[PDB]
Enzyme design. Structure first.
Site, short mmCIF file in Angstrom:
data_model
loop_
_atom_site.label_atom_id
_atom_site.label_comp_id
_atom_site.label_asym_id
_atom_site.label_seq_id
_atom_site.Cartn_x
_atom_site.Cartn_y
_atom_site.Cartn_z
N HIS A 1 -89.20 65.58 81.03
CA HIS A 1 -88.91 66.47 82.14
C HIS A 1 -89.46 67.87 82.04
CE1 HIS A 1 -86.48 63.36 83.83
NE2 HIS A 1 -85.76 63.28 82.73
N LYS B 1 -91.83 53.85 85.22
CA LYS B 1 -90.59 54.55 85.52
C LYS B 1 -90.58 54.88 87.00
CE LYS B 1 -87.78 58.30 83.58
NZ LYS B 1 -87.36 59.09 84.79
N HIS C 1 -80.32 65.01 79.93
CA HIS C 1 -80.56 64.15 81.07
C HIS C 1 -80.86 65.05 82.28
CE1 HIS C 1 -79.50 61.31 84.31
NE2 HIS C 1 -78.59 62.25 84.68
N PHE C 2 -81.83 64.64 83.09
CA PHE C 2 -82.12 65.30 84.35
C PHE C 2 -81.40 64.55 85.44
CE2 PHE C 2 -84.56 68.39 86.65
CZ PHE C 2 -84.47 67.89 87.94
N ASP C 3 -80.46 65.19 86.10
CA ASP C 3 -79.63 64.49 87.09
C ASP C 3 -80.21 64.60 88.50
OD1 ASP C 3 -77.28 62.77 86.99
OD2 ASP C 3 -76.39 64.17 88.43
#
EC number: 4.6.1.18
Length: 124
Positions: free
Chosen positions: A12, A41, A119-121
């Protein structure tokens, strides 16, 4: 094995560019960051900011994650981001993506000591 914090950086972060420079940004970066090696992905976001500015989000506005977890945080400020998501023609191993530029707040999940993104939400 790779830590969750390190995986966040690999998936990210792109501190080396200020925005996506062409329609091929996602194709190239999804490949280079190994996000297409075993499968395509489907969606991914890259953040064009310093690492410290993104890590600092873990001390910004708490909000529950999509999945309900309570260790999510929204940035106070907008950030330069690139949204990557598969084109209709994407077909492993020739994964293919639409690059979209934006300036959005980000929401990340944080863990650890130091307390950093894992984590990228969402971009919002």
């Amino acid at each position: 094995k790779e830590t969750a914090a390190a995986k966040f950086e690999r998936q990210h972060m792109d501190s080396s560019t200020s925005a996506a420079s062409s329609s091929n940004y996602c194709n190239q970066m999804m490949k280079s960051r190994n996000l297409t090696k075993d499968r395509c992905k489907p969606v991914n976001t890259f953040v064009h900011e310093s690492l410290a500015d993104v890590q600092a989000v873990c001390s910004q506005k708490n909000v529950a994650c999509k999945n309900g977890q309570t260790n999510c945080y929204q940035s106070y400020s907008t950030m330069s981001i690139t949204d990557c998501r598969e084109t209709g023609s994407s077909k492993y191993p020739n994964c293919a993506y639409k690059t979209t530029q934006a300036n959005k707040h980000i929401i990340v999940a944080c863990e650890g000591n130091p307390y950093v993104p894992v984590h990228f939400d969402a971009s919002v």
